[PDB]
Amino acid sequence: FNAHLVAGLTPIEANGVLDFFIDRPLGMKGYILNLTIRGQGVVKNQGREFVCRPGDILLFPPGEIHHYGRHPEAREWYHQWVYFRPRAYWHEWLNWPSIFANTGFFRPDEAHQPHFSDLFGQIINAGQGEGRYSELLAINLLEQLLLRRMEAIN
């Protein structure tokens, strides 16, 4: 199984078996990009909270605190994630402005939201494909997403 990029969808339903905030103080070894597709969510970090709506991409550097879950007034919090080990030269494009601590955040303007959510959607599919070149495609597409953000931020 993959040793570079993994992805998937976590559909949180109210009172479902997955309806609960996840918490890992020691973060993780790899990075994580989070995109909220259905409903709302909320991240936490030492008392501080942030609500993520549809079309929001959150970045979680290695070791960063992971504490988020569905928003109590949201019927659900569906989000797509991508766990990865970036390429050496990718770091410059991973310096996102953090809502707090070192948790990057990016909210595409109303006009770019469609493209980004879609590219991200392709990354998820590539990441879950069985094809021998599936992972390399997801990696490539992830890189495109990053690169697109850099130019999108002008």
Add this chain to the structure above:
Amino acid sequence: PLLPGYSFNAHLVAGLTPIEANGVLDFFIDRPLGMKGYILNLTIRGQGVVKNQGREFVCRPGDILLFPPGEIHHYGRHPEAREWYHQWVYFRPRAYWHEWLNWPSIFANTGFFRPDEAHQPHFSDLFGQIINAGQGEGRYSELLAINLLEQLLLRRMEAINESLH
């Protein structure tokens, strides 16, 4: 630095050559010692003739050719053709691309890839994006072009990987 006088890009440059019969561009290009970087060439309209030591080959719309460093370049509009519009991209590959740059040759070490009738639009379309980004003035256009080129090469590996024969 990749191509002095055309662009400032040091890694990837690209352009379009709309050769029309009897026009300013209606002439053959001859490079007996090739070029330092790689070249990918896509015919989008008309026909061309690729020559290499007494041998010829007729490239058609959708045909992508690969000319590696030092390989000989000798091509131009096919005489029986009204024109020959082709898009090209000159570049220095990233180190890990080489496994995906060893294409089947039509002769010598001149690569060749004619996509499936069903994949033609996707490759030709992706090839254009690379062109547009490779010529972009944006701070990250060259980088995006390199990314798109990497995509194209991967799509080809993936495509060959499951086609038949």
